[PDB]
Enzyme design. Structure first.
Site, PDB file in Angstrom:
ATOM      1  N   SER A  47       0.799  -1.220   0.000  1.00 23.08           N
ATOM      2  CA  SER A  47       0.000   0.000   0.000  1.00 23.08           C
ATOM      3  C   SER A  47       0.840   1.283   0.000  1.00 23.08           C
ATOM      4  CB  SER A  47      -0.922   0.076   1.220  1.00 23.08           C
ATOM      5  OG  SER A  47      -1.951  -0.884   1.133  1.00 23.08           O
ATOM      6  N   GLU A 145      -4.448  -7.177  -6.512  1.00 20.00           N
ATOM      7  CA  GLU A 145      -3.475  -8.046  -7.176  1.00 20.00           C
ATOM      8  C   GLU A 145      -2.043  -7.593  -6.982  1.00 20.00           C
ATOM      9  OE1 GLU A 145      -6.389  -7.004  -8.638  1.00 20.00           O
ATOM     10  OE2 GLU A 145      -7.385  -8.878  -9.197  1.00 20.00           O
TER      11      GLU A 145
END
Ligand SMILES: *[B@@-]1(O)O[C@H](CN)c2ccccc21
EC number: 3.5.2.6
Length: 270
Positions: A47, A145
């Site tokens: 992230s 993904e």
């Protein structure tokens, strides 16, 4: 070279105890001194790309004065796992600025995918990073993904060094105009997901902003931060980890410990 690793620190023992690899780059922006360990190896972004995503949105807002205020409505199909803010506004929509803040401060995945679409996808974010001189960063896939963190796979990776260099340009340098630079800093300062990572090594009376990443596999997690110690120039740093086995767990404590070693290596009293 002359100012890199003036003082050696036991990163190798730290990563061996962790059971994987740790990559660290830290820059004292006053003197230019650096601490560097595996700094040019690739590690998955997880992230952590969402900070650069928000910066890219801010850059576009310099030419599109209405962009941050634009209301974005999305369907339930946009709400992938770990979308803690955007799930509360499904029935109302959110502004571009709100999506950007959620992506940075809560690592909101639906917000990140919506903003990626605004920029033209992973290649559009990669292009923004190229435009500030980062030739290492690559985003290739979307959430979720991009978190696969497969050993040896360069997709959705950067290096600790390039992360720190780009973070410096965006938060302290001239890559963003001054108002957007401060907005990016403020979003990073308001992050809620990093209290056990770089922030745990930073005294409470110093200002700090950060963005975390956690892939969920291969012991792969990270954090990058800008830190303002009082009375001296800011420090920019990045700490990335990975490990060889898919079910190896990440460690927040290892990231905090590596950040402590980096600050010690720079002679910053904490
Ligand atoms: B990204 O690394 O940050 C959040 C929080 N751990 C998250 C959740 C799910 C998938 C990717 C990411």
């Amino acid at each position: 070279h002359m100012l890199t690793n003036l003082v050696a620190e036991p990163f190798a023992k730290l990563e061996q105890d962790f059971g994987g690899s740790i990559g660290v780059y830290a820059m004292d922006t006053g003197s230019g001194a650096t601490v560097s360990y595996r700094a040019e190896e690739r590690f998955p972004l997880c992230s952590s790309f969402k900070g650069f995503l928000a910066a890219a949105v801010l850059a576009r807002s310099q030419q599109q004065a209405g962009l941050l205020d634009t209301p974005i409505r999305y369907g339930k199909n946009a709400l992938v796992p770990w979308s803690p803010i955007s799930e509360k506004y499904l029935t109302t929509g959110m502004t571009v600025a709100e999506l950007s803040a959620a992506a940075v401060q809560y690592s909101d995945n639906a917000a990140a995918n919506l903003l990626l679409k605004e920029l033209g996808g992973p290649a559009g974010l990669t292009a923004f990073m190229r435009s500030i001189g980062d030739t290492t960063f690559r985003l290739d896939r979307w959430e979720l993904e991009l978190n696969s963190a497969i050993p040896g796979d360069a997709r959705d990776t950067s290096s600790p060094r390039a992360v720190t260099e780009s973070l410096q340009k965006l938060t302290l340098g001239s890559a963003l105009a001054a108002p957007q630079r401060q907005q990016f800093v403020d979003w990073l300062k308001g992050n809620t997901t990093g209290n056990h990572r770089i922030r745990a090594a930073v005294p409470a009376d110093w200002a700090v902003g950060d963005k975390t990443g956690t892939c969920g596999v291969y012991g792969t997690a990270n954090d990058y931060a800008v830190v303002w110690p009082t009375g001296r120039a800011p420090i920019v740093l990045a700490v990335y980890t990975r490990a060889p086995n898919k079910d190896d767990k990440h460690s927040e404590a290892v990231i905090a410990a590596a950040a402590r070693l980096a600050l010690e290596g720079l002679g910053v009293n904490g």
